[PDB]
Design a protein around this ligand. Structure first.
Ligand SMILES: Cc1cccc(C(=O)NN)c1
Ligand SMILES: [Cl-]
Ligand SMILES: [Cl-]
Ligand SMILES: [Cl-]
Ligand SMILES: [Cl-]
Ligand SMILES: [Mg+2]
Lengths: 142, 129
């Protein structure tokens, strides 16, 4: 998956496609918009390939990671989604949406204590009042 | 309508992506090559070399029927090229279908003008019981 590719790239330390600027920003933006065109039409499998492609080229990109994590969550691949949401948070530390969605995933993974920690973080640190209500609704059910 | 039909990505960038897909393939980075060849086949299903790349990945992963299916399409997408038929013969042998495999290698021998490919096909035929 995306995470194992990132680790292999790091182990081998050899030149990556991004290291040589193999794909311009403008083309990456286009491919990202095509990925959502597929996603928005319900073509989830093609969207997944396109987000995997983006995450091979530029793994450390919150927008690409969040798109792939959403697909895994929809596909009920909850651990893969949770792992990617955590990468996104590490790279975009001021947005608690990935923490909220990780909480949902942990609930489906039968890890209510991990889910509780996620929803509590949202309520303590997010300034998104609507996201906080949603997190509290989950907490109320735990 | 394909993404290629509307020139969604410039030709030179697609060439680079194909070369990167083959780089992953040659380095044994099969998961990444598979993503890249799937990307290429979404962009232009009608490109025989893109299809052959994905079929090769499936064959390496021992998804022999899935490979054979794509090879039949590739044979339609190529220019009198019996290489996909040769690889279908290999897949059929792995699927325990030796008479189907024999027919594949015989077709290569009878129609192909690629002498090196025919040598390979004959070596398989010689071993079939
Ligand atoms: C994305 C994120 C950030 C912080 C904590 C968690 C978690 O799962 N705690 N149990 C997840
Ligand atoms: Cl937030
Ligand atoms: Cl837990
Ligand atoms: Cl198969
Ligand atoms: Cl048979
Ligand atoms: Mg507050």
């Amino acid at each position: 998956g995306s995470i194992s590719t990132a680790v292999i790239d790091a182990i081998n330390s050899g030149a990556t496609l991004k290291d040589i600027n193999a794909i311009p920003d403008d083309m990456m933006d286009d491919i990202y918009s095509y990925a959502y065109d597929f996603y928005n039409k319900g073509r989830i499998e093609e969207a997944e390939v396109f987000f995997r492609f983006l995450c091979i080229y530029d793994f450390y990109n919150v927008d690409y990671i969040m798109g792939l994590a959403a697909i895994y969550q929809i596909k009920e691949q909850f651990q893969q989604a949770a792992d990617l949401y955590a990468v996104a948070f590490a790279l975009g530390k001021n947005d608690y949406t990935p923490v909220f969605h990780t909480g949902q995933c942990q609930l489906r993974l039968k890890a209510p204590l991990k889910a509780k920690e996620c929803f509590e973080l949202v309520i303590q640190h997010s300034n998104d009042e609507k996201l906080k209500i949603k997190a509290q609704s989950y907490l109320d059910a735990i």
